[PDB]
Amino acid sequence: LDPLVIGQDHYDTARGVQYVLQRYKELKDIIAILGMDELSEADKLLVARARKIQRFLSQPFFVAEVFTGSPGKYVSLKDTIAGFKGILNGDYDHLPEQAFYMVGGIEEAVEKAKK
Amino acid sequence: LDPLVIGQDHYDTARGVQYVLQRYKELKDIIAILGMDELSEADKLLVARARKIQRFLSQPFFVAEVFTGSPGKYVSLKDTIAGFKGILNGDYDHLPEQAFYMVGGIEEAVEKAKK
Amino acid sequence: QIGKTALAVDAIINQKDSGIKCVYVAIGQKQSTIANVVRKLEENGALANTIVVAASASESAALQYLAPYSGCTMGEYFRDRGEDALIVYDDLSKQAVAYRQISLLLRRPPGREAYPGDVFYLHSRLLERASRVSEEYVEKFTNGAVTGKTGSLTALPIIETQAGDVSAFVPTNVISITDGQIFLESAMFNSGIRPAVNAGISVSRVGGAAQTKIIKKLSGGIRTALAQYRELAAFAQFASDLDEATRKQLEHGQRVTELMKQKQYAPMSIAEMSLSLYAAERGFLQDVEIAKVGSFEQALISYFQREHAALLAKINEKGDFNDEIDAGIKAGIEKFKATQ
Amino acid sequence: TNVISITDGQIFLESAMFNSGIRPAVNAGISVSRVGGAAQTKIIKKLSGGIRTALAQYRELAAFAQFASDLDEATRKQLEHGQRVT
Amino acid sequence: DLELAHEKAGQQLREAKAQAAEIVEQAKKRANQIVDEARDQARTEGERLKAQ
Amino acid sequence: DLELAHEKAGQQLREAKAQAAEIVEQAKKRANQIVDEARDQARTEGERLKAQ
Amino acid sequence: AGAKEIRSKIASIKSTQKITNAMEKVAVSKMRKAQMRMAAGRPYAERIRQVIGHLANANPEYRHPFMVEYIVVSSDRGLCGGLNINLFKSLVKDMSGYREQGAEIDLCVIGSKGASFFRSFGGNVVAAISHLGEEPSINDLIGSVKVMLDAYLEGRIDRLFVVSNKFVNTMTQKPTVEQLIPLHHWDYLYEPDAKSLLDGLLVRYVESQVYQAVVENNACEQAARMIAMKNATDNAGELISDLQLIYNKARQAAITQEISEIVGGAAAV
Numbered sequence A, B: 001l002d003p004l005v006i007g008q009d010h011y012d013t014a015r016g017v018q019y020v021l022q023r024y025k026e027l028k029d030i031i032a033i034l035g036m037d038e039l040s041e042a043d044k045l046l047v048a049r050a051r052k053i054q055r056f057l058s059q060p061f062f063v064a065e066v067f068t069g070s071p072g073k074y075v076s077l078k079d080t081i082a083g084f085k086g087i088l089n090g091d092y093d094h095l096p097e098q099a100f101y102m103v104g105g106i107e108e109a110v111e112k113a114k115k
Numbered sequence C: 001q002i003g004k005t006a007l008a009v010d011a012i013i014n015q016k017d018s019g020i021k022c023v024y025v026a027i028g029q030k031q032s033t034i035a036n037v038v039r040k041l042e043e044n045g046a047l048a049n050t051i052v053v054a055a056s057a058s059e060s061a062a063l064q065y066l067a068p069y070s071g072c073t074m075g076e077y078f079r080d081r082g083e084d085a086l087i088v089y090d091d092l093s094k095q096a097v098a099y100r101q102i103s104l105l106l107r108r109p110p111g112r113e114a115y116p117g118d119v120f121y122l123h124s125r126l127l128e129r130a131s132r133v134s135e136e137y138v139e140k141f142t143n144g145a146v147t148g149k150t151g152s153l154t155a156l157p158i159i160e161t162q163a164g165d166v167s168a169f170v171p172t173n174v175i176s177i178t179d180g181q182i183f184l185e186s187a188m189f190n191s192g193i194r195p196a197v198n199a200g201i202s203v204s205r206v207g208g209a210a211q212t213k214i215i216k217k218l219s220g221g222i223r224t225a226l227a228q229y230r231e232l233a234a235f236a237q238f239a240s241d242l243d244e245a246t247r248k249q250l251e252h253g254q255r256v257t258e259l260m261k262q263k264q265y266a267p268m269s270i271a272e273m274s275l276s277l278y279a280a281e282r283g284f285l286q287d288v289e290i291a292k293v294g295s296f297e298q299a300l301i302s303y304f305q306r307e308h309a310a311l312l313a314k315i316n317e318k319g320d321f322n323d324e325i326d327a328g329i330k331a332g333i334e335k336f337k338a339t340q
Numbered sequence D: 001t002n003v004i005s006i007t008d009g010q011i012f013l014e015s016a017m018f019n020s021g022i023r024p025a026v027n028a029g030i031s032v033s034r035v036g037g038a039a040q041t042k043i044i045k046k047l048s049g050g051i052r053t054a055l056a057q058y059r060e061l062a063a064f065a066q067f068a069s070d071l072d073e074a075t076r077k078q079l080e081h082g083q084r085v086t
Numbered sequence E, F: 001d002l003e004l005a006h007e008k009a010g011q012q013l014r015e016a017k018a019q020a021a022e023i024v025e026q027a028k029k030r031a032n033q034i035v036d037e038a039r040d041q042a043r044t045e046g047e048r049l050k051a052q
Numbered sequence G: 001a002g003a004k005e006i007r008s009k010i011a012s013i014k015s016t017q018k019i020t021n022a023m024e025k026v027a028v029s030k031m032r033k034a035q036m037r038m039a040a041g042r043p044y045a046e047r048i049r050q051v052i053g054h055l056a057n058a059n060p061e062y063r064h065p066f067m068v069e070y071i072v073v074s075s076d077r078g079l080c081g082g083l084n085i086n087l088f089k090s091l092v093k094d095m096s097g098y099r100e101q102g103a104e105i106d107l108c109v110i111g112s113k114g115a116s117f118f119r120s121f122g123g124n125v126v127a128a129i130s131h132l133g134e135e136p137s138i139n140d141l142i143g144s145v146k147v148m149l150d151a152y153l154e155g156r157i158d159r160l161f162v163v164s165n166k167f168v169n170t171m172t173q174k175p176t177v178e179q180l181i182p183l184h185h186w187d188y189l190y191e192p193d194a195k196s197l198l199d200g201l202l203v204r205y206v207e208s209q210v211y212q213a214v215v216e217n218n219a220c221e222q223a224a225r226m227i228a229m230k231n232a233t234d235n236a237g238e239l240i241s242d243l244q245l246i247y248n249k250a251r252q253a254a255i256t257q258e259i260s261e262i263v264g265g266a267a268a269v
């Protein structure tokens, strides 16, 4: 995980995901006591993206098919970077939070949101 | 620290400072979650005096000039008593909180507020 | 995994032109990690000025226990002859684990966490060698061959904590022996502040005596001001709009917080650090957006390096400061912001 | 733990009360004498009942002392009495 | 005052032409510096003929 | 007219600064090529000599 | 790390739980102040309605434009138990009827959270007021009310309503929409002309209804704030109970570890 090994685009996407997840972890106690509605307009947007990133990290495996029934997914590095970069930029702010759960590539989150 | 060893004026000033700082210790954790605006008119005023007292305890030493950069201050017993009684009685409520940080006797705090 | 080795290796790389000899002691590390550090020293041109002492994870606990003392002895050669040296102990906590093994196998009675009774003396005997010696000591050691010169050995020991627990026996002992400490925080590292230095907990007991005139004046009070900004940011977090004194302190602390961020393998000279400190403490960053502080600093340094190269060369001779240099920097920063 | 279990009662002194100007520092909410009223004269046994009740009411209402202007008159009466007994 | 206002607007107008020209001139000067520094770095990187 | 003069001056300054940023970004893009073409040639010739 | 960090987290949450328990009663106290202010303003509105009713029935010579064929109230502060959300959710239900009818909409905004809502979706604001005290004065509402009355006289608005919460009970705030502008044996002795009297009274009537909607919404806000602080007090209690279980685990581990280091040390000596 070094700019000289993986290139700046991958490195900045990974650093962006970690920054959002770290800030969401700091708000956990306040959200439990006062709820999400007391946060600032900036923190509310970040928490919404953190919840989507956290769900998009999930993936159905080809060895886990027996446990649930869902078919496995293989996602390339190119598709992985494109999905998280779009969620960080805000290109998917309108799609529902459950559309990112168990879908492999980012285009499948767009098709899952149609239901 | 006994009125029969020193005097009632010194003792009352010391216990007065301690009372203000002890009450502020329970309010510190409150303000960080629900904010300052929700406290009583007497608490808001007391918290401001406690933060000022907490800063007026500071003093630049001659042996610490290499760490602080500013010159060293020697303060006397009467000067110390008069300065803390002034903050407790409200004679300096109009001065900003940063004016009491690193300033020997009470006079210099009145001068730092002008810079 | 929060940059302890990165901080010490960059400090060794910066000495290639300083005239200070370097020693890196690797205790209980895997051989491929040691080979990667050596490759990075070579890639940065710092290997020709460094001695690397290795006692890898597969080697005898006796060699891992002795390695810091062997490296210290190699560094002391320069100190005793009127020269300056720097030594890094990448893990004194691994040296303590190797000594605990030997002591338990020798059946010596254990202490506070199964560690030997003299685990304090293990580190205090090592760390008290790092010192500055007078001209009379160097003159007496060299039998008059070297005169009018002091000698020194500077040490950068590293310690690992478990989930931030500093109450452990070994960290408690070492924190009680050194002339200061640099605390690295995982929450700041995850939040993108990558040098991850907690300014409130970190402290240097030598202070301003260890700085050049320009950095000593431009950095006075920054550490305690940041410590008070972190508290103010938490106290005023959900409260309604406050006075100008509060807004001034908060807006300044946010800018210095963003300024302290730096990349790995990218050291700054006295002049580059000085321009960055001057632009912040003299109020020039007040109009700059927080998200633009990094771009402003990089552009300013690039500007002064092109339009003001003779001034940077004058600041870099000894880190001197006066009204002429102060006015020279002021005129350059004003011209920069008014045209870039 | 051993000595608390051997003795007939305990008087607990507290640093938070001592720093708040309550000089004797006796935390009356946790301190206890198992012998109780049998160790008191008729006059002290009669007067102490209302005082224990007042300190109990003060411990329950202490959080409202900063907002006493918004209390019900019947509750304000217990709070003001509790402050003077304390 | 309207005639004087046209002259004053004429000063802001010529200043904008000159300032915009300097902004682009400084960019070309910066671009030249970046390429020269890259050439000296690439020339120094040649230590690998011995170092590796 | 004075309001329009102020708006036109500001528009051209934002445009010139946008052109300046593009001129500098292309120089950064070129610099990486100068360094990486030297790196691959130096490593390849070093390996050529090592095999020999 | 261990027992010390857990003990610090418990003390912090315990301090917060005590004030949320107290602020629940502060909100009940302010709820009662708002409820007495709701009752104090009723006699004025009902008498103006009685005068206009007779003065229109008895005088068939003139029909006011208000007798022939949204103002949104919201809070300025935090701790609202879904008060503003239930109201905005409901506004869309009546607006849907206007979308099926094909009618155009103009909006007026009272309070900072209402202004923040329409600004986050592109809503067309014709007028707006904010930062009002917990006990508001009717003279601040005159401006926002007049812009909405003028839009009716200019023929830009066919019907006007006030969107606000109603106090069903101390545990229930109901979101509502109420129509404002479109509403026998003796006669009055009019000193000025009857048109001037009817025109003047109808303005006072609408302003009074908007003020009553604002005061009843403030009573609903203090009731919603009581529930929210009650819930925060209860939620903090569950967190303290769980942290006490984690602390007990660390207490038992510390005693077991110390004895295991002590027994090992005495076995070697």
Ligand SMILES: Nc1ncnc2c1ncn2[C@@H]1O[C@H](COP(=O)(O)OP(=O)(O)OP(=O)(O)O)[C@@H](O)[C@H]1O
Pocket (backbone or CB within 6 Å): A001, A002, C001, C002, C003, C004, C005, C006, C007, C194, C195, C262, C263, C264, C265
């Ligand atoms: N200034 C920096 N900017 C960006 N990334 C950095 C910086 N400093 C360190 N890192 C990166 O963070 C990681 C730190 O690893 P490093 O080995 O230096 O930490 P460590 O504490 O010594 O880890 P370990 O416990 O394994 O020895 C590496 O990936 C490194 O490249």
Ligand SMILES: [Mg+2]
Pocket (backbone or CB within 6 Å): C004, C005, C006
């Ligand atoms: Mg390391």
